[PDB]
Amino acid sequence: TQFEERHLKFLQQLGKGNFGSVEMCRYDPLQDNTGEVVAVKKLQHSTEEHLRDFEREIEILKSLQHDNIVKYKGVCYSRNLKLIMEYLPYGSLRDYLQKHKERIDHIKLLQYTSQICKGMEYLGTKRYIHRDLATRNILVENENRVKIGDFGLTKVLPQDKEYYKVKEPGESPIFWYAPESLTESKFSVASDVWSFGVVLYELFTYIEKSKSPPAEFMRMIGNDKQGQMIVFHLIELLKNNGRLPRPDGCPDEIYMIMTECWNNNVNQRPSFRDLALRVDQIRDNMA
Numbered sequence: 694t695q696f697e698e699r700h701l702k703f704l705q706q707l708g709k710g711n712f713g714s715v716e717m718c719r720y721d722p723l724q725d726n727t728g729e730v731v732a733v734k735k736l737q738h739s740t741e742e743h744l745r746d747f748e749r750e751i752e753i754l755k756s757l758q759h760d761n762i763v764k765y766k767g768v769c770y771s772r773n774l775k776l777i778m779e780y781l782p783y784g785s786l787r788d789y790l791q792k793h794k795e796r797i798d799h800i801k802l803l804q805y806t807s808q809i810c811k812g813m814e815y816l817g818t819k820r821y822i823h824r825d826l827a828t829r830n831i832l833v834e835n836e837n838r839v840k841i842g843d844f845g846l847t848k849v850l851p852q853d854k855e856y857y858k859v860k861e862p863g864e865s866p867i868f869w870y871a872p873e874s875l876t877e878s879k880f881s882v883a884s885d886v887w888s889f890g891v892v893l894y895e896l897f898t899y900i901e902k903s904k905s906p907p908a909e910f911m912r913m914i915g916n917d918k919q920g921q922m923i924v925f926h927l928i929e930l931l932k933n934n935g936r937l938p939r940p941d942g943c944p945d946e947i948y949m950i951m952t953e954c955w956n957n958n959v960n961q962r963p964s965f966r967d968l969a970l971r972v973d974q975i976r977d978n979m980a
């Protein structure tokens with residue numbers, strides 16, 4: 694549906710970036726402070742290219758109905774289009790994990806992993822490529838439910854191809870990128886699987902700053918390397934089977950899933966359905 698901007702009461706900025714921002718608002722049409730708290734995404738600097746990219750993003754989210762995908766609530770028109778989503782009270786999985794390290798066990802991490810795989814399998818069914826799987830893009834509804842919380846880089850596959858070539862201006866999250874995304878700008882369900890492997894790594898490191906993917910790769914590449922060279926050196930490291938280490942305390946069977954996601958050969962990477970089965974099997978064994 695449509696939301697009138699005049700009844701959208703700003704409460705707090707939730708997160709930013711060069712694209713725009715996400716705000717916590719209260720949609721109070723009766724002006725009696727009984728309206729619901731919603732999350733509002735807006736474009737900070739909007740070209741006609743950015744406006745059209747954001748229109749596709751809204752259509753993509755509107756088309757998704759799944760327990761592990763943040764709910765689309767509507768749009769807001771002024772010139773300045775806004776995407777209205779449900780408010781998830783625990784924020785990103787990155788921040789929630791980091792704050793409750795001592796209360797979240799491996800069985801709990803695997804419950805979240807399984808939800809991410811299920812939400813991602815639903816995406817693939819619509820031929821959508823997320824392109825930005827990271828714990829900062831996963832939101833926490835409650836202690837038992839996580840949801841893919843942003844679709845800013847999501848692309849629809851062409852009808853004739855299993856990949857999508859795209860080189861966006863700006864800073865790309867290169868330490869989550871599959872080798873073929875770095876070398877050829879090719880994005881597919883298989884590069885989403887590679888990035889999912891990195892999400893799995895992030896979870897089992899409990900978001901330790903020293904143990905983060907930029908920190909680990911930047912150490913393996915050498916902090917003396919800078920600029921466009923980092924990309925070149927990362928490509929070479931990946932090409933020579935250089936990988937993120939097994940996180941402290943991580944079981945071998947969980948690191949095995951990560952390394953299987955990090956296959957150089959695109960076609961050898963597991964599917965999200967197989968990842969979900971495997972994760973479920975492991976958490977049943979643990980329980």
Ligand SMILES: CNc1nc2c(cc(C(=O)N(C3CC3)C3CC3)n2C[C@H](O)CO)c2c1ncn2C
Nearest residue numbers: 707708715732779780781784785788830842843
């Ligand atoms: C607290 N609840 C919510 N916080 C949100 C968002 C979206 C972001 C956010 O800024 N981004 C994330 C999508 C990836 C990013 C800018 C796009 N943040 C910040 C986050 O809490 C950091 O802990 C959200 C929330 N509820 C529903 N949504 C959509």
